[PDB]
């Protein structure tokens, strides 16, 4: 599950709505630990 | 992250060269479909 917001809400270009800033609990090298990761995804790759 | 402003990805095709290219294509299409006709180019239909 990803928690995504619009990367920049101030864009007035054709790119508004593209590039979402998605956070998730990703696994790490050790099986017992988790890490919080923030990354950008294109709108076409992420579905609500 | 992205350094600096967010800009849309794009392609640039010269108008004069493309228009000449289509002119060549229309005459070659006319050789099979008939002269004194209208050849229309339009955007692709929907799908994937």
């Amino acid at each position: 599950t990803l928690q995504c917001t619009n990367y920049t809400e101030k864009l007035r270009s054709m790119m508004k709505g593209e590039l979402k800033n998605c956070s998730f609990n990703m696994t790490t090298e050790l099986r017992d630990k988790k890490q919080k990761v923030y990354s950008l995804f294109y709108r076409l790759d992420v579905v609500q | 992250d992205i350094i600096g402003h967010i800009r849309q990805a794009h392609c640039n095709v010269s108008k004069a060269t493309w228009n000449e290219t289509l002119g060549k294509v229309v005459k070659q299409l006319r050789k099979h479909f008939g002269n004194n006709t209208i050849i229309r180019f339009a955007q692709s239909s929907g799908g994937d």
Epitope: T8, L11, R12, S13, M14, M15 | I3, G4, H5, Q8
Partner: antibody
């Protein structure tokens, strides 16, 4: 450089429409700049009314959207503002100004962020009275 | 709307003394690293004249004594030294989000 000169009624009866025309002299309205209107009035700091691109697309202040229309006349090199249903609260000095643009990219895709009103006119004082 | 709080309403210094005028936006005006904070000098009876663009860049034709600074919503503009010809009402302006908004205006006078 380019100078801006305004003209229109300085006295408008309440509830009619004010029409101000700003002439552009020395520059060209049909250029990569946005044209805008700003007002000043005692008790109120500068308040933005709206802005136009020579393509005809325009942005307006949300509280005035129902009453202010602006336009560009490419043959006259003039920028016009028509404000309907004027009230006593609308008394102000109205300035025409040129808003410089960063244009960091292809203008067809937006990619323009407004960056400074560098040229201002002298201001037309308008009082609403009758 | 983005609301700009300007402070002080009035500031006065003697000739040769530097002055700083503050502008506090209700929200961030930095878009992808560029601080869209503008600063104008409006002399009494005159239109405002843009002095500083993109928060810290000096406009061409404006004396070198003017400069700016700031990031996010907290901006500080300054005159160093203030001269006799600098008596004016100064305003901040934001272009981050429509509608464009202006500050209250600070009256700089000689003392």
């Amino acid at each position: 450089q380019v100078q801006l000169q305004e003209s229109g009624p300085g006295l408008v009866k309440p509830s009619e429409t004010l029409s101000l025309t700003c002439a552009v002299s020395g520059g060209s309205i049909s250029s990569g700049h946005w044209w805008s209107w700003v007002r000043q009035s005692p008790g109120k700091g500068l308040e933005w009314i709206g802005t136009i691109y020579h393509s005809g697309s325009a942005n307006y202040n949300p509280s005035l959207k129902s009453r202010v229309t602006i336009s560009v006349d490419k043959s006259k090199n003039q920028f016009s503002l028509k404000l309907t249903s004027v009230t006593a609260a609308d008394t102000a000095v109205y300035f025409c100004a040129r808003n410089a643009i960063l244009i960091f990219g292809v203008i067809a895709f937006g990619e323009y962020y407004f960056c400074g009103m560098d040229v201002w006119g002298q201001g037309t004082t308008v009082t609403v009275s009758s | 709307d983005i609301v700009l709080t300007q402070s002080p309403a009035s500031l006065a210094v003697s000739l040769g003394q530097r002055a700083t005028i503050f502008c506090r936006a209700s929200d961030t005006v930095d878009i992808s690293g560029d601080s869209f904070m503008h600063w104008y000098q409006q002399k009494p009876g005159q239109p405002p004249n843009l002095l500083i663009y993109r928060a810290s860049n000096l406009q061409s034709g404006i004396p070198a004594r003017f400069s700016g600074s700031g990031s996010r919503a907290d901006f500080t503009l300054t005159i160093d030294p203030v001269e006799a010809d600098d008596v004016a009402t100064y305003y901040c302006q934001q272009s981050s989000e429509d509608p464009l908004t202006f500050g209250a205006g600070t009256k700089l006078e000689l003392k």
